[PDB]
């Protein structure tokens, strides 16, 4: 929200990806599901602002 209201460039780095593999134990398809989800949520929210 703050970055939109001040019109900057918009970069996103999803980090800490072992937390899906060793910590979460998520098979790859549903792993992709969660990744797509984070992406679609943040994108819809930027669409909000």
């Amino acid at each position: 929200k703050h970055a939109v209201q001040e019109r900057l460039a918009v970069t996103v780095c999803i980090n800490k990806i072992d937390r899906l593999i060793l910590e979460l134990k998520l098979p790859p398809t549903d792993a992709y599901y969660k990744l797509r989800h984070i992406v679609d949520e943040v994108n819809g929210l930027i669409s909000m602002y």
């Binding site: 910590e23 979460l24 134990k25 998520l26 098979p27 599901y33 994108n43």
Partner: protein, 56 residues
């Protein structure tokens, strides 16, 4: 950051194995999205030397 490492019951079911313990993802949204999607039928093709980097 709370760690969530889920104990298994048996050795049997695979290492990666979605267990009921995790909450079912079911991510919902609007009409989800579309992309700058580079349709095929223009062309693209994989010189069959590479592989998904390890499948063996």
């Amino acid at each position: 950051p709370n760690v969530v490492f889920i104990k298994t019951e048996d050795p049997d079911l695979p290492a990666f194995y979605f267990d009921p313990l995790i909450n079912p993802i079911s991510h919902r949204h609007s009409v989800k999205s579309q992309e700058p999607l580079p349709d095929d039928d223009e062309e693209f093709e994989l010189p069959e030397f590479v592989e998904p980097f390890l499948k063996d």
